[PDB]
């Protein structure tokens, strides 16, 4: 692409993942610096003993209830924001239980004494958050009926459990007269919120004995120890130990004297914690597991580790793994840095996601719905349709369409009634257009309006657009390949296929065109298409055989991709210049690379094309059959996603010929047996070419930067429940892909309330390279470090982008205003009035409200100049009519005649009605005194119709009569 | 008046008794007033709701057990770890929870209610899981080498204390802190800031401010005697040599004859001239106001010199006044050095000669046990006290006073008050050969009491008619000391000094006083003959700018410097140990570890700070107050007059130079005028605000705004109150658990002693009789109103008056209180009241002399009168040899028949009273004066028998006191009478039982204090919490007024961007 540079080629898109978790070594959590300012003021207030060894006991004992009091605080806040992040907890301490070095309580190791001491203390810890998890049962069960808030609601829980304390302060500093009275007006000022929030007595009352229940399970565990001489057998008995950590514990000291696929695979199959999941971040950070797991048990060192020693580029692929979602959070600071590093378009959306995510994700689709409002698309579809003629009218339909009447089908649906304005709904439900046509531009109004859908996109977008940049020759069109991509995506959501399935066919392809059929399934069922059964190597094979270093390039090269790719061709080089030099015209480059410049057709544009087309439809073919147990659930989910209760109007297609049938309808190329090519060229590629021009506002924001539209579903990863209740949740079973071996995760959502609440959200790494299987991560010095997964893609990429030429695939044969916009718009006893012949039509129509075509006009956001302009050529071509048709008959034809005169007269008469509103408009205009394009919108402004207006005059009437007499006399003859 | 109980009509008749019986109704007034008569009509339990919510009270309990003795004490308070196992175990019993790792059921608040609730301790349970500069051993160490013959010596080996781990808390090694940096921080948030940030061997002689004694002797006539060692010193005054000196003997200095005679009160005399160097000439001040030097004349001011010229006739002891020079006949200056310097021991006790009187110039004790048998103890002091006396009062503390014998003021002397006082004859030298001095009206008055004693005696040898001699020379002093009185003239009215101009400070603040627990411990080892100063027990709370005035003036030991810089302007705020910006803090800092003394010294609770006083160039510290006897000796002395990270890089700069050479010393005040300036810097700037709060402040109390930062302030400000109000609560709490375990070890061993105390015993009044060398006076002190010497009273040898030869002695025992039972008797009492006697006695019985036949016979007498045949007969084979009436070999004084006397009662408890103990000794003492004997006496105290002896002369009053200082004057006169009478058990009850009651009635000073703290932090406390709750509610404001522009901000760059976005799609490669 030579009109443009290296500069503001590469810029156009970005895909270098930023930095944004910082701690400092010297930096404190909120609630350890609460903490010590409510101790070091106890402290000031004390009752020194009076020996001075007891003194020392004392202000250890001090600083021991200030860790444990801010231990119990931490927890008691984490678990208050995410309940499971409880489960990840716990059973990561309980892997640890009894070799954990780094215990905060705690400031060749024969002494029974520390090794009962080490288990003891982390029994505490998982006593401790059982009690934590019990306190949050019993709050949620009170707080279920009042209604807050959810920050008010999480205040007073971290304030419960503050006062909770307050008798183990009291007594642990000495009952002291100071102390009491700090704790006492803490606890009277937690008494007065609690009694304005709704709570009784027996509730508070409840909820402090809950909490001061949490807070004695320190000095209870260890009364226990000191108390039975450290007799391990009886504090199982107990019950306080968990009996399969304990077990655990017993076979590690008395034993005491590997491919990432496996492990990964085994990861993301299971909800719950597993400990091999550590094992899978072990290799991503050259980290031990034990290491990881000790950082992770203690936040700030955690945050240290995050913030120094691993860089921007592990913390995505990490995320996109899916390990997040399973690692524990052991602090709030823990979940708020991870939140700020995933960047979402807008900062204040992440800052409503670290307090409270539902009203996060609404806000994000509220956002998404108003710029999909005031889009380039959503206001011009029926100017640009009825001008360019790729949309027909309501009363064109009737005698238009012999058999392509059944291809045709209105714009309008139920839900587009809660996008626009119903003077538009009347507007937009006037118009009839190719059922491919409908489709595509619902579902480029699906994609651009959805989250879930924007961010599987914005994924597959950074993925392809960050493997390209790396190849220096293939970098130099990346803007081409994005439009060609969104173009895809489109067409194939429109198609009806699974769009969060697109990863897995742009890694199947970019398998095969490297490595052939072999790199396939033969020995396990597929998909379920005909009468039986078919493999994964056997389907592609079939779709290979029905649709037409690197070993299969050559099976690019058919008679389908090169229509395909001239398709796709002629759309960039109309909508825009050509790709090689800009100025040139639409026509002119694919005619000189047809009809002439032999061993010269497909260019690198050509071939990215051809092959994303392969892609797409590859994706559409697994994704319209019937799949196993895994691939069906998010085909069902996908198909649900869509806006009309019926674009699932039977697309599951069980044999061969009806899938092929559909996927031909919907991929146009010429000739077929599809309706005809004049059809295709006059009704449904020129919609093609104004979707080029006229993407939605989001869709363009997502292909500029992708990252921040995936860290939706990234901070999706770290809070994923539903504010309704937690009774349906079986996120186990879709996560049980078992067709492919690719890191793709594709999970449910649970933020959104309607109408995707099941929405779906793909965690795909941006550094997987199909091809070789490694993931090239960066790291935090700045090389290249390539992980093994159980000649990449950009060895590809460059191969399809050099200046190698195929010679003459296949065919190779040849080459393939206004004012009717203006009129498009125009709408018993009122034929039989006007049937032929009749005057009195103009005094039983100039009134009325769904008359005034002015209106449908002004609904269609059309400028006053453009009105003017439409008027005035609707005259000429008026005034060409009458002679053509009363003094030029090429064909003296009755049945012809009577048509094209009911035709000119009709459009007379909508002559005069927009001359007397227009008129009208203009003496508003001069009574007004006003400038004309403020007015078009003050139209809307004053939500006024022409209705209200009586501007009559005398002489203005009489004279539009008399002219409308003359234009018809003649006329009707 | 008819209604002097201010009651109603019928109640007023029925107080009277004017109601007849017949018109009484005997029930209404029964119900009404009052001689009328009474009449009386599962461990692991679920805690209630009342228990539980009794948890979060500030107040949930009124127990008071502060004032429930228990002497039996069996302190063994544990933590019920059984009890606590008993409630896990029973707690475990029931339904399993389920949906947790653990599955044993949740003990709904029972747990923390035994564990932490009410009805060997849990921190030690606790600190199973986890070295210290003993100070204390240290000082032993020095202190014993001191002590070592070889040393110096006077030599008292300290007992070594008991370990530190089970040391009191308020011991001698605990005052520079309790030695805790490494495992808490100091208390103080902005100190734990600028921790974070970084910027945090004679030693027994101690300089406190800036660079002997003479017995008396019954004399053929009054003596002066004098230990003799020679003067160190000679008094002379070198300024004008040759003729014009005297040289009087009395006075053992040399005085000038005349022939070489050619709103501060003091800036009011001198009219403003306080500046060191701006100070005018004195001759100005006397010429320029008159009315303040003159004896309100025009212009005839003359010191009389011919008076003091003359050497004094029969060695007549008055002190002459300051010499001046000029004479009146009818210029800024550099102030220094007008006067002699020298050292002063302010320890030292001092006893100058009496005024008036002539000079020649040149341990164990019987105690009776409760079974009964009269063992010895030997008295001996604990490790405790010993260590804190040897570090606080047997140290040398100087002092550089002002050598008044040997100062002369001159014509250019500058108008220092010391000036103004010598000129105005305001402050006289006492003592012969040490700078003591006393003002002047204190000399006058003792020469009018001198003279009126003498008059008297003159008097009684008048009516006696002795020699002409003694007459003569009786005359000869009594015309000397009117003479001296208006010392010119034999006719002048006497006259009146008027106040000095120099402030007085009491020599406790440059001393140390000792607080009630220490002095509680001294008290638990009573020792006879001992005084407690009740100067040294009187603290009141100071203020930090008292206590930074009193380091200005006391210098650095180490390097003689202020301790604190003279622009050093409120350096302190805390009162905390654990503080960094203290006192203690800043010694601490200073490496001043081993003086305890300074330590003591700028306490919160001390001596009182005159702020103006110590401001003054020269000021007075009075060593020892006023008595009938002796002047108020006193003392003069003379007074010698950038960011956080620029200054961290400095600090470590600083620290880094140590490790070369550089100069000698070259670091101490550049490092402290560097930490003062940490100190002191403000918190407005915004990178202090963003280090503070960033470092301390929580996020949720963060802002920019002025309110959030004035609330800052306030926040600082309201914690420093906090941490200087449970300080001083903390500490009275400590004293107060010592106090009381003092109190209750000193109950249980007094249980031990039986009870022969005679306290309920009221003698009867003694009975009037028929009735050349000069004796002494005697002294004796009551609150009785109208008292003669016939009153007498109740003590260890028995009935009859008793009279003190100190004056000391009967002072003490005017402000103790009158007995209990004593009390309900005196009809009237009165201010404390010394009276004087001159004791006429024909013959005198010694007490600790070989006993006489007639002692005996009186012995015998009154035994075979009081006691029965077989008393008798006990008593005699118990006391008399078997054979013989000779008394026995252990028994050869009266005072060891007394303490027989007290055996034999103590042996019969069942059927012998105290009363009946002295009653026999009264009797005894009935029967000596029938015999003739007058009075009984060993030197001090005499025990006058016959009131007709001595005659009554003067009364001087005394100040009454509170509580406290009459306990103490009580245990003072018991100590005392024990330390005469050590083997008398009754001197040693009566000693005890005043250290039980001194004991107690501190105690309850004590509560007081503690009671007045803890309402002083319950409302600091109130004040922080409100303060915290303002700011916060203020930066909550903030945080979301700036969090709802920012999102406001985001949400127009959406639409902005979208609308952008939104038109059409025609750049060619622009996206």
């Known amino acids: ?973 | 008046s008819a209604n002097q109980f201010n009651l109603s009509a019928t109640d007023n008749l029925l107080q009277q008794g004017k109601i007849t019986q017949e018109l009484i109704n005997e029930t209404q007034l029964t119900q009404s007033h009052i001689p009328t008569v009474y009449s009386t009509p599962l461990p692991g339990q679920k805690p209630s709701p009342e228990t539980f919510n009794s948890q979060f009270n500030a107040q949930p309990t009124n127990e008071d057990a502060s004032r429930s003795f228990n002497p039996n004490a069996l302190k063994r308070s544990q933590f019920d770890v059984e009890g606590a196992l008993a409630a896990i175990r029973n707690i475990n019993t029931q339904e399993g929870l389920t949906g947790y790792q653990t599955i044993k059921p949740w003990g709904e608040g029972a747990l923390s209610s035994l564990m932490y609730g009410l009805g060997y301790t849990l921190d030690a349970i606790r600190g199973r899981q986890y070295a210290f500069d003993d100070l204390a051993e240290r000082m032993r160490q020095n202190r014993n080498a001191r002590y070592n013959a070889i040393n110096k010596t006077f030599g008292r080996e300290i007992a070594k204390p008991v370990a530190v781990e089970e040391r009191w808390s308020t011991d001698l090694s605990f005052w520079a802190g309790f030695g805790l940096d490494t495992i808490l921080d100091p208390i103080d948030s902005i100190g734990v800031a600028w921790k974070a940030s970084g910027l945090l061997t004679n030693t027994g002689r101690v300089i406190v401010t800036p660079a002997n004694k003479y017995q008396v002797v019954q004399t053929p006539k009054g003596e002066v005697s004098i230990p003799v060692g020679q003067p160190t010193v000679q008094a002379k005054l070198p300024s004008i040599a040759s003729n014009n000196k005297v040289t009087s003997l009395t006075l053992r200095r040399e005085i000038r004859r005349p022939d070489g005679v050619i709103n501060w009160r003091w800036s009011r005399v001198v009219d403003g001239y306080i500046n060191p160097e701006g100070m005018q000439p004195i001759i100005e001040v006397v010429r320029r106001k008159p009315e303040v030097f003159t004896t309100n004349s025009t212009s005839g001011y003359s010191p009389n010199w011919e008076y003091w010229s003359a050497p004094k006739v029969d060695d007549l002891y008055i002190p002459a006044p300051i010499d001046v020079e000029f004479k009146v006949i009818p210029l800024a200056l550099p102030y220094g050095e007008p006067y002699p310097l020298t050292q002063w021991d302010l320890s030292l006790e001092t006893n100058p000669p009496q005024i008036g009187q002539r000079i020649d110039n040149n341990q164990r004790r019987r105690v009776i046990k409760a079974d009964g048998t009269a063992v010895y103890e030997t008295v001996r002091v604990n490790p405790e006290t010993q260590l804190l006396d040897a570090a606080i009062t047997n140290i040398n503390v100087v002092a550089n006073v002002v050598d008044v014998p040997s100062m002369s003021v001159s014509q250019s002397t500058p108008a220092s008050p010391l000036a103004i006082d010598a000129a105005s004859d305001a402050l006289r030298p006492v003592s012969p050969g040490t700078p003591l001095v006393a003002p002047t009206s204190e000399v006058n008055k003792q020469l009018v009491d001198q003279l009126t004693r003498l008059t008297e005696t003159e008097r009684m040898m008048k009516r006696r008619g002795a020699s002409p001699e003694t007459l003569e020379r009786i005359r000869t002093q009594k015309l000397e000391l009117r003479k001296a009185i208006a010392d010119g003239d034999e006719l002048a009215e006497p006259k009146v000094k008027p106040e000095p101009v120099t402030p007085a400070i009491n020599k406790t603040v440059l001393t140390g006083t000792m607080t009630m627990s220490e002095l509680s411990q001294q008290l638990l080892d009573n020792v006879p003959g001992s005084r407690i100063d009740p100067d040294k027990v009187r603290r009141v709370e100071r203020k930090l700018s008292e206590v930074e005035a009193l380091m200005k003036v006391i210098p650095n030991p180490i390097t003689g410097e202020p301790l604190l810089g003279s622009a050093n302007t409120r350096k302190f705020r805390t009162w905390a140990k654990d503080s960094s910006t203290s006192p203690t803090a800043y010694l601490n800092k200073l490496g001043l570890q081993e003086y305890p003394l300074l330590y003591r010294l700028f306490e919160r609770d001390g001596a009182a700070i005159d702020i103006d006083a110590l401001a003054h160039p020269e000021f007075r510290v009075i060593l020892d107050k006023p008595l009938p006897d002796k002047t108020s000796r006193q003392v003069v002395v003379s007074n010698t007059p950038m960011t956080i990270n620029e200054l961290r890089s400095e600090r470590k700069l600083l620290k880094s130079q140590i490790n070369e050479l550089d100069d000698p010393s070259d670091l101490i005040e550049r490092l402290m005028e560097l930490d003062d300036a940490i100190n002191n810097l403000d918190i407005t700037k915004p990178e202090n605000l963003k280090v503070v709060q960033d470092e301390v402040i929580p996020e949720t109390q963060h802002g920019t705004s002025p309110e959030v930062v004035k609330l800052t302030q306030q926040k600082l400000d309201i914690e420093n109150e906090v941490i200087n109000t449970g300080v001083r609560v903390q500490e009275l709490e400590l004293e107060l658990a010592r106090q009381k375990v003092q109190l209750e070890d000193a109950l249980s061993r007094i249980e031990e002693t039986a009870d022969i105390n005679p306290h309920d015993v009221i003698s009867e009044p003694l009975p009037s009789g028929r009735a050349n060398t000069t004796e002494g006076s005697l002294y004796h002190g009551t609150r009785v109103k109208g008292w003669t010497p016939g009153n007498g009273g109740v003590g260890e040898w028995g009935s009859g008056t008793y009279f003190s030869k100190s004056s000391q002695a009967a002072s003490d025992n005017a402000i103790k209180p009158l007995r209990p039972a004593l009390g309900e008797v005196i009809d009237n009492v009165t201010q404390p009241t010394i009276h004087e006697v001159l004791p006429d006695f024909k013959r005198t019985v010694d007490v600790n002399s070989p006993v006489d036949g007639d002692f005996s016979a009186a012995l015998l007498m009154s035994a075979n009168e009081l006691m029965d045949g077989s008393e008798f007969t006990s008593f005699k084979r118990s006391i008399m040899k078997p054979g013989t009436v000779q008394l026995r070999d252990t028994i050869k004084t009266p005072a060891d028949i007394y303490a027989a006397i007290e055996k034999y009662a103590a042996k019969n408890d069942i059927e012998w009273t105290p009363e009946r103990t002295h009653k026999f000794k009264s009797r005894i003492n009935e029967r000596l004066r029938l015999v003739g004997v007058d009075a009984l006496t060993d030197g001090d105290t005499t025990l006058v028998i016959n009131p007709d002896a001595v005659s009554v002369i003067n009364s001087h009053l005394l100040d009454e006191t509170d509580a406290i200082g009459t306990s103490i004057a009580r245990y003072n006169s018991a100590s005392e009478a024990a330390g005469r009478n050590s083997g008398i058990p009754t001197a040693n009850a009566n000693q005890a039982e005043a250290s039980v009651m001194l004991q107690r009635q501190m105690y309850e000073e004590t509560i007081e204090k503690l009671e007045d703290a803890k309402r002083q932090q319950r409302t600091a406390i109130t004040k922080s919490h409100e303060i915290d709750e303002q700011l916060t509610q203020t930066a909550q404001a903030e945080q979301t007024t700036k969090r709802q522009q920012r999102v406001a901000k985001s949400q127009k760059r959406a639409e902005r961007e979208a609308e952008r976005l939104g038109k059409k799609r025609d750049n060619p490669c622009q996206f």
């Open chain 1, 1 to 973: 692409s030579k009109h443009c540079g290296l500069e503001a080629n590469q810029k156009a898109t970005d895909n270098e993942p930023k930095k944004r978790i910082r701690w400092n070594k010297s930096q404190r959590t909120l609630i350890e610096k609460l903490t010590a300012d409510k101790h070091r003021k106890l402290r000031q207030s004390r009752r020194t003993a009076d020996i001075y060894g007891d003194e020392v006991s004392a202000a250890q004992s001090q600083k021991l209830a200030e860790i444990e009091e801010v231990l119990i605080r931490s927890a008691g806040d984490v678990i208050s924001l995410d309940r499971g992040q409880y489960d990840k907890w716990a059973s990561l301490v309980s892997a640890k239980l009894g070799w954990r070095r780094g215990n905060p309580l705690n400031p060749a190791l024969k002494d029974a004494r520390r090794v009962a001491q080490n288990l003891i203390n982390d029994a505490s810890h998982i006593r401790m958050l059982d009690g934590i998890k019990r306190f949050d049962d019993i709050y949620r069960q009170i707080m279920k009926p009042l209604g807050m808030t959810t920050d008010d609601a999480r205040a007073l829980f971290n304030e419960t459990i503050e006062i909770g304390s307050i008798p183990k302060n009291n007594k642990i500093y000495g009952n002291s007269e100071g102390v009491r009275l700090i704790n006492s007006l803490r606890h009277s000022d937690y008494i007065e919120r609690a009694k304005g929030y709704g709570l009784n007595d027996e509730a508070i009352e409840t909820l402090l004995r809950a909490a001061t229940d949490v807070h004695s399970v320190f000095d209870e565990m260890r009364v226990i120890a000191e108390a039975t001489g450290h007799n391990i057998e009886e504090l199982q008995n107990l019950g306080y130990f968990p009996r399969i950590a304990t077990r655990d514990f017993n076979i590690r000291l008395r034993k005491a004297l590997n491919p990432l696929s496996s492990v990964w695979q085994k990861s993301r199959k299971f909800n719950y914690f597993v400990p091999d999941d550590l094992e899978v971040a072990s290799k991503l950070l050259n980290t031990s597991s034990d290491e990881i797991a000790e950082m992770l048990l203690n936040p700030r060192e955690w945050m240290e580790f995050l913030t120094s020693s691993v860089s921007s580029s592990q913390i995505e692929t990490m995320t996109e793994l899916g390990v997040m979602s399973k690692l524990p959070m052991t602090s709030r600071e823990v979940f708020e840095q991870l939140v700020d590093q995933y960047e979402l378009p807008y900062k204040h959306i992440n800052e409503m996601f670290k307090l409270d995510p539902h009203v996060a994700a609404e806000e994000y689709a509220r956002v998404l719905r108003q710029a999909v409002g005031n889009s380039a698309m959503l206001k011009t579809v029926v100017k640009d349709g009825l001008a360019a003629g790729w949309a027909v009218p309501e009363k064109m339909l009737k005698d238009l369409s012999p058999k392509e009447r059944a291809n045709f089908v209105p714009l309008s649906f139920q839900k587009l009634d809660q996008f626009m304005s119903p003077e538009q709904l009347e507007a937009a439900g006037k118009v009839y257009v190719h059922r491919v046509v409908s489709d595509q531009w619902r579902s480029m109004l699906e994609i651009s309006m959805s989250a879930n859908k924007l961010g599987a996109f914005a994924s597959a977008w950074s993925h392809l657009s960050t493997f390209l940049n790396k190849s220096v020759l293939a970098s130099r069109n990346v803007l081409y390949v994005g439009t060609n991509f969104l173009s895809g995506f489109v067409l194939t959501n429109a198609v009806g296929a699974n769009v969060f399935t697109v990863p897995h066919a742009m890694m199947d392809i970019s398998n095969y065109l490297a490595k052939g059929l072999d790199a396939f399934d033969g020995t396990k069922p597929f998909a379920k298409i005909g009468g039986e059964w078919i493999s994964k190597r056997e389907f592609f094979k079939q779709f290979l055989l029905k649709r037409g270093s690197f070993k299969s390039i050559g099976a690019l090269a058919d008679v389908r991709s090169a229509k395909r790719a001239l398709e796709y061709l002629w759309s960039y080089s109309s909508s825009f210049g050509d790709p090689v030099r800009g100025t040139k015209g639409a026509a002119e480059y694919v005619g000189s690379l047809l009809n002439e410049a032999t061993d010269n057709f497909f260019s690198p544009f050509a071939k990215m094309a051809s092959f994303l087309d392969t892609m797409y439809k590859w994706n559409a073919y697994t994704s319209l059959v019937e799949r196993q147990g895994a691939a069906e659930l998010a085909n069902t989910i996908a198909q649900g996603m869509t806006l009309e209760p019926i674009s699932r109007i039977g697309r599951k297609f069980d044999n061969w010929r009806d899938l092929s049938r559909h996927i031909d309808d919907y991929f146009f190329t010429f000739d077929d047996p599809g309706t005809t090519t004049k059809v295709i060229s006059k009704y449904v590629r020129p919609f093609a070419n104004w979707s080029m021009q006229s993407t939605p506002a989001m869709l363009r924001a997502a292909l500029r930067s992708p990252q921040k539209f995936s860290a939706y579903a990234k901070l999706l990863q770290l809070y994923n429940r539903g504010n309704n209740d937690d009774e349906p949740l079986n996120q186990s079973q879709l996560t049980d892909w078992q067709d492919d071996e690719y890191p793709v995760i594709l999970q449910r959502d649970a933020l959104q309330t309607g109408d995707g609440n099941g929405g779906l959200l793909v965690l795909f790494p941006h550094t997987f390279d199909p091809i070789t299987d490694t993931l090239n991560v960066i790291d935090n010095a700045g090389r290249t470090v390539n992980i093994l997964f159980g000649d990449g893609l950009t060895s590809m990429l460059t191969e399809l982008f050099n200046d190698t030429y195929w010679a003459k695939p296949a065919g190779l044969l040849l080459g393939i205003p206004l004012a009717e916009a203006l009129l498009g718009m125009y709408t018993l006893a009122w034929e039989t009035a006007v049937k032929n012949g009749n005057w009195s039509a103009l005094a039983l129509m100039t009134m009325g409200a769904r008359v005034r075509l002015i209106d449908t006009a002004r609904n269609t956001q059309m400028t006053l100049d453009e009105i003017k302009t439409g008027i005035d050529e609707l005259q000429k071509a008026n005034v060409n009519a009458a002679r053509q048709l009363t003094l030029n008959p090429e064909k003296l034809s009755e049945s012809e005649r009577n048509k094209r005169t009911e035709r000119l007269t009709e459009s007379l008469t909508a002559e005069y009605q927009m001359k007397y509103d227009y008129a009208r408009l203009i003496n508003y205009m001069k009574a007004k005194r006003i400038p004309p394009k403020r007015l078009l919108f003050e139209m809307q402004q004053r939500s006024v119709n022409v209705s209200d207006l009586e501007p009559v005059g005398g002489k203005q009437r009489l004279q539009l009569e008399s002219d409308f007499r003359r234009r018809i006399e003649e006329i009707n003859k």
